[PDB]
Scaffold this active site. Structure first.
Site, short mmCIF file in Angstrom:
data_model
loop_
_atom_site.label_atom_id
_atom_site.label_comp_id
_atom_site.label_asym_id
_atom_site.label_seq_id
_atom_site.Cartn_x
_atom_site.Cartn_y
_atom_site.Cartn_z
N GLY A 179 43.12 -20.57 8.36
CA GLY A 179 44.21 -21.51 8.10
C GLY A 179 45.11 -21.72 9.32
CB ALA A 180 47.66 -20.89 10.92
CG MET A 181 44.77 -16.85 15.71
SD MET A 181 44.61 -15.28 14.84
CE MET A 181 45.30 -14.19 16.10
CG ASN A 231 45.97 -17.68 19.20
OD1 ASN A 231 45.15 -16.77 19.06
ND2 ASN A 231 45.81 -18.88 18.65
CG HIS A 263 51.60 -15.78 7.56
ND1 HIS A 263 51.36 -14.96 6.47
CD2 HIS A 263 50.74 -15.38 8.53
CE1 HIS A 263 50.40 -14.10 6.78
NE2 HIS A 263 50.00 -14.35 8.01
CD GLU A 264 49.56 -17.61 11.20
OE1 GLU A 264 49.46 -16.50 11.80
OE2 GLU A 264 48.89 -17.83 10.19
CG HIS A 306 51.29 -12.55 12.40
ND1 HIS A 306 51.02 -11.27 11.95
CD2 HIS A 306 50.57 -13.39 11.61
CE1 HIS A 306 50.18 -11.34 10.93
NE2 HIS A 306 49.87 -12.61 10.72
ZN LIG Z 1 48.66 -13.47 9.26
#
Ligand SMILES: [Zn+2]
Ligand SMILES: *[C@@H]1O[C@H](CO)[C@@H](O[C@@H]2O[C@H](CO)[C@@H](O)[C@H](O)[C@H]2NC(C)=O)[C@H](O)[C@H]1NC(C)=O
Ligand SMILES: *[C@@H]1O[C@H](CO)[C@@H](O[C@@H]2O[C@H](CO)[C@@H](O)[C@H](O)[C@H]2NC(C)=O)[C@H](O)[C@H]1NC(C)=O
Ligand SMILES: *[C@@H]1O[C@H](CO)[C@@H](O[C@@H]2O[C@H](CO)[C@@H](O)[C@H](O)[C@H]2NC(C)=O)[C@H](O)[C@H]1NC(C)=O
Ligand SMILES: *[C@@H]1O[C@H](CO)[C@@H](O[C@@H]2O[C@H](CO)[C@@H](O)[C@H](O)[C@H]2NC(C)=O)[C@H](O)[C@H]1NC(C)=O
Ligand SMILES: *[C@@H]1O[C@H](CO)[C@@H](O)[C@H](O)[C@H]1NC(C)=O
Ligand SMILES: *[C@@H]1O[C@H](CO)[C@@H](O)[C@H](O)[C@H]1NC(C)=O
Ligand SMILES: *[C@@H]1O[C@H](CO)[C@@H](O)[C@H](O)[C@H]1NC(C)=O
Ligand SMILES: *[C@@H]1O[C@H](CO)[C@@H](O)[C@H](O)[C@H]1NC(C)=O
Ligand SMILES: *[C@@H]1O[C@H](CO)[C@@H](O)[C@H](O)[C@H]1NC(C)=O
Ligand SMILES: *[C@@H]1O[C@H](CO)[C@@H](O)[C@H](O)[C@H]1NC(C)=O
Ligand SMILES: *[C@@H]1O[C@H](CO)[C@@H](O)[C@H](O)[C@H]1NC(C)=O
Ligand SMILES: *[C@@H]1O[C@H](CO)[C@@H](O)[C@H](O)[C@H]1NC(C)=O
Ligand SMILES: [Zn+2]
Lengths: 4, 903, 903, 4
Positions: C288-290, C292, C324-325, C328
């Site tokens: 869905g997403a990452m 980086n 959410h991302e 992180h």
């Molecule tokens: Zn995550």
């Protein structure tokens, strides 16, 4: 026999 | 078990042969303290010793013996013979024998008598002496009735239960005083009260003719009847539940039975020898009907008829089934097969002769033509497999009751009928019936094999100085002793013909050798531009004759009216001329041959003998075809396409194509029937109308969907005033259920539960399987297994209706794999219709995944085995392998063809 | 392979540790003469020898090396070290290593540099450095982009590819002169022409912070962007295809991204240290997403938003995924898991903290409450199995990329979030965030295990003089190191509480031992007649306290607003009082606890802890419930009933019951929306409306069927003027397709093929799976496997939609059994979403037949194995066995209950 | 990671  | 002992072998010894029997049977039509319905009986068989032996081996199935003088039976002398003492007896269950071990040997050419006293369950199992049940209001009526064929006479009394062990039978029935006892013959003197209990009567019947055990019938009921003496002096009575008789529902049977019996007596120059022929309809009955000599038994849906609620199709079933069982009075009863491997001598004959009798009774219906669809093309489907079997199987292969029941199949019936149709065609019916009269006269009260038939037909040929390319035996052995049939391929450029064994799968492995090398002697009829040519006999694998050469615009077709049991292929130029004729004026080709062109081409395509697009192109003219037969042939061939493609991308375009092809016909009938107010006058047109509605609705013609849903809704609003003509009911009910939901289904189920006609219940029972909802199909499957809801006689038929629904396929196949012992043991694993279930559940298989399931199913059930469905499983494996390859080869071309031709 | 050799073991040796890397990569965005898209690169890694060794073991996956000075790599000294000569190199494929065998040993605490030159495929495989493609008109646009997590950095350049091997990275991208190069950091100086070919530019980027290899990103495209400096001085840019940016579809992301980033920086008292955070949406993206670091990547449907066509649900997805991302950046990037077994330290944190960030951006939506449904109850389904796993799995069990990818699961995400929600509740968020600030400060640019977290939370507890029954470590170890959760059973007669490990199947076999004996330390909140009571800590298996005793009319409920990760059962008298309260005035119970009462009781019934009729009785009040949450909890629990019963007689009555329960709500919304002209103001009411429509239509409310078919027809008549509000589109499309036929399906498919919004394509893609026609589902299954029709990123998601359809069940399961190697190899057998496919296809299984298929599937595929779906297969076996028993025990009672309560 |  008809089997039917 | 030890094969060296005679009692472990399935065929009776040739050492003993019965002469006559007396049998007394007493059914108890109320349950005992155990909750069991039982019958009690006694018997004496007088028999002749043909070869000295120290054992009496006689059939006995599910009988318990009362000891007498220290043993299960008593053995007595006749005419001064002095039998040895009995050592001991045993019951050997697999071979179904009572074995009487003697202290010495019987004497050759001496007679003896053996007395037995026994009891069995009067079970609801539709076999032997069994019980049938119905309700009259809230009163439970219980009937004691019989079905002996093939191997169940032994379930009612001990007997030498093989068809060539003919004897006379002296029957006594002891029954409640208020109930009527019936058997093969008329009562001998008056019915007297039982001394021990005057609530029971004793009815003794006159001795039967010499006859086979499988033809015995014993019935105790309170049925009513209508009666009429036939023009040959024979008394006909039609017996059924009192309410059916009072309603007049036996009247059609009475109208046709005596006249058909008299017709057959005249046609075969052989009188019916018994004083009466009773026809009786049972509420619970395994088969469709059974030709018991003097007491012919039927399912209600095969004998009764309601002119206000039964369809024309139902009426055709009644007259044809009556004609069929009456045909057996000659072909089966008077003259009987020596053993079951030659079953077609009974069933193939009755299947052909039924049309002659039915046509006699109903000459305006043109029933004889239906043989092409109902027999020829029906059986060619299975007879194009490597795992088919000859019309006459070697006798040594047919031993167990399962193997015997298995032969009541499309080969024995419809191939039997087809080969006789062909024989009648090339001999003429006049010459044919002359040889048959001779056959019947010579072998009356005896048993025959296929060779006996040829000898008597030869006698007629020789008397008429008819010249054939060889003897009747040598022609007809080609069609009788090897499986299959030829495709005859014509090259119209040169006039060459050739034949080869037609196999649906080129790669299939024929492992049964033929001493005839799969070469036939073939009577070939033909037409050239619609004009019949001289007949020809193809005797070799190839020949040349100018009869088969064309030039310019001329076309030829072989097998006029499909009288011969063979398929025909042509060079593609002749096929194109045929297709041109179909576009120019399709009426120039006889109607039966229009069906032929369609059905042959589809089968040829499967076998890789013509391109599939050639077969599909042969259906293009159907858009302007109004005749029943060519449409029915197309729909039958396209059934295979539906089975192969209805879970695939091909299905939309297929439905679009059929929708296009049928719409004008559907609109024609809408107009011609004055918006469904009337039905056509002619029977074939009535059938064409039903197929047009069925096809329009299945394939999405909006006017059809609206019509069926509208009519069914009108019925729901007025349940006691059904607005749907009986001819239309099956198709309206099915499609209204398919288009609807829970409410329509529940209404139809309540109508089924409350039905007071078997014909109406049957239409509803099939319709309920048309639900598109998986949960509803699952619930319905659970009902088929509940004898309080669906009669046991109807369980597997209803299961088949469910598996035919694309949504029911996975459901039923998974059920069959998960419940094999139950189905095998309780749902007729050794009986007549079991092959039908295996065939129905597997005929969609077209994937490696399904093949692997089928192979694993075979492996997993080795120990139970497959009973009378053993050959059907082998056929299912062969077809599945063929189907995987066919789908791979054809799916793209077929998708493109339907897409490009449906617009 | 020989386990004694380090290069055959999955974990890297501890002998070498990298310091920094430079990497140059050059993608070729046009195919070569072979038809392959490739990238060429070079790298130098500087590393420190920690223990003398004669081998360099480094990760390398699908890279081909250019020989330099006679070997695959060159090894050089640093700071005067003098490395031995290279003997030879090898590529060891299973463990994905390049192994450099040396002629001597490296020296402890010395540095070395290794130089490589390499080439790989720029494949369409969504992993490593890969290609994404889109069309702008008829022009093919090709993007080079990355996904490294978990173990794919090694697919782009050789590296020590484990998360605790942190290093600085110096990235150079060589790219066509017209395209923009992006990476984690900003460019270092200007982009210069490549000397060998000025059609290419060279873009070097500033050195990264010390960071893990899995967080590297390299992107080459012609995307456009919108930008805004956030209030903490960080530059935010939202990058996407030019047409999306021009249309304004990046504007919502720009509105929320910087504000959320600043919010987290303040909340955790820890600045974001990088100069920018780019958000970029890719047309082809596995996940869905990452997150980086500096270059956060997203599927288009997770970043872009069209206010005129995207739903409120889509908008919620965008803000929550961004939140959410961004979470992180702290929990994962700045501070990183030591190894993947502790993945919840990244994902459990981001899953909890996303709500804080999203709530900050959208305070009127009340998103934090959704944690109960979206996390707590979501994960409790799998965490009630014996084959679940602890939040922190022992590190020694997690070795292969398949085992690593498997942990991106409901435990690591949603149980992680649930335990943090509980911790925040009993500590207070003020104390929680204080301990977290300490954790982040101490471990910035380093790696952590679960124990490190407890130490810092303890420091905050100790500073605040907060008294707990023991240390944070000992409380939280109970929730982290053993699987599962307790059911807390209350006897309100005596005020006793007890706990036991909650298992959905009483008979299941827990084989994983726990040093804590499956006993928890549980913070218990409660209410009495709606008033909150004093908090309680349950430390033992049983206790007594007057907090839990009632008399007279009083009721109690435990777990107010479901902040604790546990289920609750009561004596049946208290349950009856709760049911009375629900009938009298359901608003007296907090809305979250109404969801609790429903969801807990259904789960308890499965476990044989309450009668199933108690759980069904808890749904009776829903007929007057308007709130989203309790209805969603009911529908989620009843999903299981649908899976168990939608191929059974129970299904009609179930649908009748749901129809009854939802009709007044459906009518309420019909009226309140002025006949669907408007949507509710409040987000939860918007969701309630969608569920009311979905439920009404699925269960046969006629007004709903008419509405959806009418709207879809109106759309078909005016394709460019869609009359359906975006919130209603998924449910209207699905139900209009289900109610319709080929015409509706074909229209929706063409709309899908022509879609210019991922949100719109996604709704159509799911809807197409709602066809009731098996042939259409089969055809659609064939499209999922064609990357020209359905993007590879969407293949298994679409397959799941098909298997969820009752008609698609057999179809997809048979397909999975028949195509296992294909799915395993080409459809992500070692990746994140593979468990979802196994779960979806098996969750209907409730029969011995299906169990036997599943067991045979396991046996047949032993050699291939099940990759990241291995645990899911074990769970499917456990659930199937539980389901067989549950159906047997419950089918009659449930049938009767739905029948008797649906009227 | 969101798995989606
Ligand atoms: Zn995550
Ligand atoms: C069945 O009934 C027939 C007819 O009554 C019996 O046949 C008679 O048998 C006796 C004794 O053997 C002969 O002398 C008579 O000539 C026979 N009559 C006729 C008309 O054939 C026969 O015995 C009976 N069989 C049994 C087993 O009871
Ligand atoms: C089935 O009919 C189609 C349509 O007529 C045949 O294809 C045509 O063949 C003619 C003569 O060879 C061509 O000139 C046409 O252009 C074809 N038309 C189309 C629409 O394809 C096809 O050959 C027939 N199939 C077979 C086996 O004969
Ligand atoms: C990556 O780039 C950084 C920054 O330019 C390099 O770090 C320098 O390394 C040199 C040589 O060891 C040191 O003397 C400098 O102090 C470093 N500068 C900084 C700011 O740390 C690093 O060497 C590069 N790594 C690689 C493999 O090329
Ligand atoms: C679910 O609710 C039903 C209906 O109220 C309960 O059955 C009733 O129980 C009461 C009190 O025991 C009886 O007096 C009623 O006659 C019952 N009514 C009916 C229609 O059966 C049932 O007990 C509840 N289930 C559970 C587990 O408590
Ligand atoms: C026959 O005997 C067996 C064994 O005693 C018994 O189970 C069965 O009920 C008997 N059959 C009848 C009809 O009495
Ligand atoms: C029963 O026996 C009596 C003679 O006692 C007879 O009149 C009556 O018709 C018999 N009934 C039947 C149904 O056989
Ligand atoms: C039987 O024949 C009579 C007289 O020909 C006829 O009126 C009647 O309709 C026929 N009955 C049936 C049911 O066909
Ligand atoms: C053939 O003719 C002979 C002599 O006329 C006659 O006795 C015999 O019955 C005839 N057979 C057949 C089958 O016609
Ligand atoms: C890597 O080498 C193998 C073996 O020569 C070759 O098949 C493959 O195409 C190469 N990969 C690239 C991207 O050149
Ligand atoms: C490519 O290089 C030139 C300098 O020669 C620069 O002006 C241009 O902006 C660069 N383009 C990109 C997209 O990096
Ligand atoms: C972003 O914020 C602006 C200014 O507050 C607002 O007008 C606009 O509607 C928002 N854009 C989106 C797509 O929500
Ligand atoms: C606890 O208090 C000490 C002393 O004031 C302080 O240095 C430390 O940062 C505090 N730790 C936490 C987690 O608040
Ligand atoms: Zn027959």
């Amino acid at each position: 026999x008809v089997v039917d | 078990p030890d094969q060296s002992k005679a009692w472990n072998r399935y065929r009776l010894p040739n050492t003993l042969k019965p002469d006559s029997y007396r049998v007394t049977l007493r059914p108890y039509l109320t349950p005992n303290d155990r909750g069991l319905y039982v019958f009690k009986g006694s018997s004496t068989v007088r028999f002749t010793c043909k070869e000295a032996t120290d054992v009496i081996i006689i059939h006995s199935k599910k009988l318990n013996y009362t000891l007498s003088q220290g043993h299960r039976v008593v053995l007595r002398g006749v005419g001064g013979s002095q039998p040895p003492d009995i050592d001991k007896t045993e019951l050997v269950e697999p071979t179904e024998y009572l074995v009487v071990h003697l202290k010495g040997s019987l004497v050759k050419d001496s007679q003896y008598e053996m007395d037995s006293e026994f009891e069995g369950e009067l079970a609801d199992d539709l076999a032997g002496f069994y019980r049938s049940e119905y309700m009259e209001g809230n009163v439970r009526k219980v009937v004691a009735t019989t079905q002996m064929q093939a191997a169940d006479a032994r379930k009612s009394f001990p007997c030498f239960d093989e068809p060539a062990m003919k004897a006379e039978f002296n029957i006594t029935l002891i029954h409640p005083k208020d109930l009527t006892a019936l058997s093969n013959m008329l009562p001998k003197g008056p019915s007297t009260p039982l001394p021990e209990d005057p609530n029971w009567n004793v009815t003794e019947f006159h001795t039967t003719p010499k006859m086979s055990t499988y033809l015995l019938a014993f019935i105790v009921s309170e049925f009513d009847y209508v009666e009429k003496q036939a023009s040959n002096g024979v008394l006909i009575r039609i017996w059924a539940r009192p309410s059916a008789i009072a309603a007049g529902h036996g009247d059609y049977a009475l109208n046709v039975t005596g006249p058909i019996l008299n017709f057959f007596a005249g046609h075969y120059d052989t009188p019916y020898p018994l004083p009466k022929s009773d026809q009786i309809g049972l509420p619970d009955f395994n088969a469709g009907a059974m030709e018991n000599w003097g007491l012919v038994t039927y399912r209600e849906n095969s004998l009764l008829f309601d002119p206000l609620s039964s369809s024309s199709s139902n009426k055709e079933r009644v007259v044809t089934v009556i004609a069929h069982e009456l045909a057996h009075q000659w072909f089966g009863n008077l003259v009987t097969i020596e053993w079951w491997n030659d079953l077609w001598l009974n069933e193939g004959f009755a299947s052909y002769v039924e049309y002659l009798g039915a046509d006699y009774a109903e000459p305006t219906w043109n029933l004889k033509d239906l043989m092409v669809l109902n027999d020829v093309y029906r059986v060619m489907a299975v007879d194009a497999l490597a795992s088919s079997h000859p019309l006459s199987t070697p006798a040594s292969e047919i031993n167990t009751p399962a193997q015997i029941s298995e032969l009541f199949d499309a080969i024995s019936y419809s191939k039997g009928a087809s080969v006789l149709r062909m024989l009648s065609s090339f001999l003429s019916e006049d010459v044919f019936k002359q040889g048959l009269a001779s056959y019947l006269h010579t072998f009356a009260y005896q048993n025959t094999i296929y060779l006996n038939l040829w000898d008597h037909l030869q006698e007629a040929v020789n008397n008429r100085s008819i010249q054939l390319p060889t003897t009747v035996r040598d022609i007809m052995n080609r069609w009788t002793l090897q499986m299959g049939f030829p495709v005859i391929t014509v090259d119209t450029s040169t006039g060459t013909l050739s034949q080869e064994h037609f196999l649906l799968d080129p790669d299939s492995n024929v492992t049964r050798p033929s001493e005839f090398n799969y070469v036939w002697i073939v009577p070939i009829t033909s037409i050239r531009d619609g004009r019949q040519q001289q007949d020809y006999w193809l005797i070799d694998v190839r020949a040349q004759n100018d009869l088969f050469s064309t030039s310019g615009n001329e076309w030829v077709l072989l097998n006029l009216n499909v009288t011969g049991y063979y398929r025909v292929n042509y060079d593609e130029e002749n096929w194109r001329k045929i297709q041109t004729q179909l576009q120019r004026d399709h009426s120039a080709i006889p109607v039966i041959n229009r069906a032929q062109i369609i059905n042959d081409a589809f089968n040829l395509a499967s076998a890789h003998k013509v391109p599939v697009t050639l077969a599909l192109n042969n259906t293009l003219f159907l858009i302007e075809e109004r005749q029943y037969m060519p449409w029915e042939a197309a729909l039958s061939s396209l059934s295979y396409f539906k089975l192969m493609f209805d879970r695939s991308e091909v299905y939309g375009p297929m439905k679009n194509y059929l929708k296009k092809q049928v719409t004008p016909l559907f609109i024609h009938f809408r107009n011609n029937t004055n918006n469904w107010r009337e039905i056509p006058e002619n029977l074939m047109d009535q059938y064409s109308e039903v197929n047009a509605i069925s096809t329009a609705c299945s394939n999405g013609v909006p006017e059809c969907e609206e019509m069926v849903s509208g009519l069914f809704k009108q019925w729901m609003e007025n349940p006691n005033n059904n607005p749907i003509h009986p001819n239309l009911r099956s198709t309206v009910y099915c499609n209204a259920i398919a288009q609807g939901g829970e409410e329509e289904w529940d209404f139809a189920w309540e109508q089924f539960r409350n039905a007071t006609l078997v014909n109406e219940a049957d239409k509803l029972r099939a319709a309920l399987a048309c639900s598109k909802e998986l949960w509803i199909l699952n619930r319905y499957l659970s009902y088929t297994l509940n004898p309080d809801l669906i009669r046991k006689q109807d369980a597997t038929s209803t299961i088949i209706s469910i598996t035919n629904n694309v949504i029911g396929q996975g459901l039923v196949w998974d059920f069959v794999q998960s419940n094999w012992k139950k189905l095998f043991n309780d749902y007729g694993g050794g009986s007549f219709s079991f092959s039908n279930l295996i065939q129905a559940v597997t005929r969609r298989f077209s994937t490696e995944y399904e093949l692997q399931q089928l192979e694993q199913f075979k492996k997993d059930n080795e120990e139970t085995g497959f009973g009378s469905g053993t050959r059907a499983l082998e056929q299912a494996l062969e077809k599945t392998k063929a189907n995987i390859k066919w789908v791979k080869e054809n799916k793209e071309v077929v998708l493109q063809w339907f897409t490009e031709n449906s617009k």
